[PDB]
Amino acid sequence: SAGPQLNALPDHSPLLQPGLAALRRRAREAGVPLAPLPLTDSFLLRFLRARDFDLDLAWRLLKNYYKWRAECPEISADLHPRSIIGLLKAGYHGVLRSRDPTGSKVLIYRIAHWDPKVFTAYDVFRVSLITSELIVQEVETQRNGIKAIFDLEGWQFSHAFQITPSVAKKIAAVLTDSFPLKVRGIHLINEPVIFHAVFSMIKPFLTEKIKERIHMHGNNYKQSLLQHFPDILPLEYGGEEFSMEDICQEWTNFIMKSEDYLSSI
Ligand SMILES: COCCOCCOCCOc1ccc(C(C)(C)CC(C)(C)C)cc1
Ligand SMILES: COCCOCCOCCOc1ccc(C(C)(C)CC(C)(C)C)cc1
Numbered sequence: 001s002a003g004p005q006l007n008a009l010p011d012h013s014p015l016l017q018p019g020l021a022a023l024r025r026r027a028r029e030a031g032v033p034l035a036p037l038p039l040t041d042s043f044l045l046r047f048l049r050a051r052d053f054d055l056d057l058a059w060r061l062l063k064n065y066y067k068w069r070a071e072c073p074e075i076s077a078d079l080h081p082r083s084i085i086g087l088l089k090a091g092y093h094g095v096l097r098s099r100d101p102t103g104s105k106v107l108i109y110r111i112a113h114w115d116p117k118v119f120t121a122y123d124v125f126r127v128s129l130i131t132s133e134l135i136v137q138e139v140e141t142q143r144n145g146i147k148a149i150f151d152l153e154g155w156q157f158s159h160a161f162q163i164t165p166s167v168a169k170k171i172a173a174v175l176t177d178s179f180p181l182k183v184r185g186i187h188l189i190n191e192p193v194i195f196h197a198v199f200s201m202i203k204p205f206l207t208e209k210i211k212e213r214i215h216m217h218g219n220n221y222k223q224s225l226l227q228h229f230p231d232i233l234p235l236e237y238g239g240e241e242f243s244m245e246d247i248c249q250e251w252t253n254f255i256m257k258s259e260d261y262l263s264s265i
């Protein structure tokens with residue numbers, strides 16, 4: 001249980017240096033790229049915290065992160081938000097202002113606001129990557145992980161058509177062992193009945209990384225979603241203070257302010 005205690009330290013604690021040294025030596029040895037991603041303490045700590053300072057797992061995650069980036073150029077080859085600013089303006093995606101009861105950052109995606117005649121699955125994936133790279137900078141998010149809510153109202157066949165076996169593989173990767181964020185929960189709301197039926201059959205065979213972390217609320221989601229996310233949801237989902245539009249505009253603004261950092265990858 002040393003791991004979670006190391007996670008709880010600030011980045012400048014000398015106690016994190018043994019793990020950082022051990023990981024940086026493994027990275028260097030396997031010939032990790034020099035390409036505009038510096039192996040700073042703060043960067044490397046993301047991987048250590050994601051795997052509670054288990055060095056072998058932090059290293060495997062780091063390698064898989066590099067592998068995933070190399071394997072998905074149409075997502076990862078340019079992180080400047082200029083390519084997806086329409087999706088953001090359309091209201092596809094926002095991050096809640098407040099954390100949930102266990103301190104997780106909460107992400108919301110709205111499928112009705114993705115026009116598949118305009119944006120590909122890879123554009124939409126680029127949105128998640130951008131957000132991920134931003135939120136991972138907060139040490140509390142590294143410690144407490146994330147939850148994502150997918151509002152599937154208006155899910156159409158044109159959306160489903162974009163999820164090929166290749167896209168499915170890339171989705172599983174980022175949820176499991178290819179990005180330095182702990183996915184503590186995946187919530188679907190307003191999703192078609194077919195999701196439940198499939199899930200009831202495949203659930204027992206899923207990786208334990210996600211198996212017990214998937215919650216499908218269906219159309220009657222208000223009460224159940226509220227139990228997981230009290231006092232932090234937008235008006236549209238049963239919250240009290242701000243609209244989803246406010247959240248989307250606030251997150252969009254933050255992305256644009258970070259445009260040079262995003263490019264610098
Ligand atoms: C889920 O089914 C709907 C299909 O949506 C389109 C597919 O592209 C969405 C990719 O979604 C994610 C979700 C989470 C993540 C990670 C695990 C990196 C965490 C996050 C959301 C904080 C970025 C990455 C991509
Ligand atoms: C072709 O359908 C694309 C819909 O994608 C939903 C987003 O999540 C992607 C995860 O991967 C799957 C898994 C199963 C399925 C279906 C519904 C087609 C079930 C199946 C193929 C196992 C019978 C679709 C996507």
Ligand SMILES: COCCOCCOCCOc1ccc(C(C)(C)CC(C)(C)C)cc1
Pocket residue numbers: 156157160186192194195196198199214
């Ligand atoms: C009828 O609508 C047309 C398109 O149909 C899309 C298929 O929807 C059913 C898909 O069912 C699932 C259920 C679970 C999953 C897993 C658990 C693998 C991944 C998850 C949680 C990201 C959806 C994938 C597909």
